[PDB]
Curated annotation (Swiss-Prot):
Keywords: Cytoplasmic vesicle, Disulfide bond, Signal, Taste-modifying protein. It comes from the Eukaryota. Belongs to the thaumatin family. The keyword Signal applies. InterPro entries: Osmotin/thaumatin-like_sf (IPR037176), Thaumatin (IPR001938), Thaumatin_CS (IPR017949). The lineage of its organism: Eukaryota, Viridiplantae, Streptophyta, Embryophyta, Tracheophyta. This is Thaumatin I. Its main location: cytoplasm. GO terms for cellular component: cytoplasmic vesicle. Taste-modifying protein; intensely sweet-tasting. It is 100000 times sweeter than sucrose on a molar basis. It is found in: Cytoplasmic vesicle. Disulfide bonds join C9-C204, C56-C66, C71-C77, C121-C193, C126-C177, C134-C145, C149-C158, C159-C164.
């Protein structure tokens, strides 16, 4: 599938794309306000994610640090990023279908729309002002809203026993973005799309 990644924020984002053990396409790219990056993701890819990184500082070698979503200090990500990160998640061509979602399980940093380019399925969006409303204990330094698992590292929030339920903190995200995962065992908000589908991920969507 083709993904057009578009930054409509007033600020630069450093887009990232990975399946956890490898880059997708070039893995990362600086997108100043108004810029776009079109990537190819191999058909059949499972566990792919796209996210924004904010306030990055890179040297000539593409090494440095980002305030949110840092992936081992690299411009071109090969691994997933440090929370808080709003996540566009996808597995492609699993038995003839694509499966997409947005997740707040690793927190929220940038508002996001994740939409198919086809009429065959719907998009999802999480663009509420989660950072401005973020409870003090979840606030990430300088920007973003951490998930409770990141902050507290207990089974209640991280769902490590394999059994967990909603919490005051998951509900915070869920009420602001009902169509995004708010904890690991949230009722799925995954959208099923045709296998031929391409996508657009928009940071700071408007219309």
């Amino acid at each position: 599938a083709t993904f057009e990644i578009v930054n409509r924020c007033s600020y630069t984002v450093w887009a990232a794309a990975s399946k956890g053990d490898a880059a997708l396409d070039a893995g990362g790219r600086q997108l100043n306000s108004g810029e776009s990056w079109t990537i190819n993701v191999e058909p059949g890819t499972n566990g792919g994610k796209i996210w924004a990184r904010t306030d990055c500082y890179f040297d000539d070698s593409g090494s440095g640090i980002c305030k949110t979503g840092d992936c081992g200090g690299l411009l071109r990500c090969k691994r997933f990023g440090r929370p808080p990160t709003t996540l566009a998640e996808f597995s492609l061509n699993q038995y003839g279908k694509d499966y997409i979602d947005i997740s707040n399980i690793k927190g929220f940093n940038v508002p996001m729309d994740f939409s198919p380019t086809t009429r065959g399925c719907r998009g999802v969006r999480c663009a509420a002002d989660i950072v401005g409303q973020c409870p003090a204990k979840l606030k990430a330094p300088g920007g973003g809203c951490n998930d409770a698992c990141t902050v507290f590292q207990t089974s209640e929030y991280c769902c490590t026993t394999g059994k967990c339920g909603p919490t005051e903190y998951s509900r915070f995200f869920k009420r602001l973005c009902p169509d995004a995962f708010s904890y690991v065992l949230d009722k799925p908000t995954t959208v099923t799309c045709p296998g031929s589908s391409n996508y657009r991920v928009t940071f700071c969507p408007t219309a």
